[PDB]
């Protein structure tokens, strides 16, 4: 069930890899690990992954008491997903600005967050 | 709100047994799972209602459970026009379309959502 996709999830982002699902009824990708697709409600789904690459969808920016800021952001990927991330500005992020993913350590385990590219 | 305060108060409302969801005031998206930005356009300016708690099952699957049996898990439409999942307990013989609900459980000292069809 779920909390098994979850679970999942983890081992892919220590493997370096951005899992999605995709729906093999109706072809609904999605990120956020769910058992049914939320779109058309069927169990046959499969683990695929993507090639990481996307975009600023929407982003608000989150300051720190030093005066620098971290973006909760909306990334959409090549594949046709989007996803909530934090967004590591590298060159100047704006809306439609490209990203690429990148994995992080955070206490201990590997997670996926985007960083704005040239 | 920062996204943590938004799912604290979800919290609160579980606990008064109320359902809360997400309405965006730019595109009228209407969402269960808490955001501080709208998942179809991207925008902040976000509120959250009420629903009435009366919905339908969208999509239902069997899971079983290790006392060999099994609980109904599925997505359910509510009638405000958001789906969400949920367990669903069956009063009547649960289907799809058959109407649900709104009922809230504890769990580890939380109240939760979660749906029972209707006679
Ligand atoms: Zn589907
Ligand atoms: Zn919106």
Redesign the pocket.
Known sequence: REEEIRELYFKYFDENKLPFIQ??????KFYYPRV???????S??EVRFSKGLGKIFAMTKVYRKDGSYVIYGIVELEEGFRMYSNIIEESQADINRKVEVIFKEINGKKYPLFKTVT
């Open positions: 729906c093999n009824k109706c072809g609904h049914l697709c939320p779109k058309c409600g069927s046959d789904i």
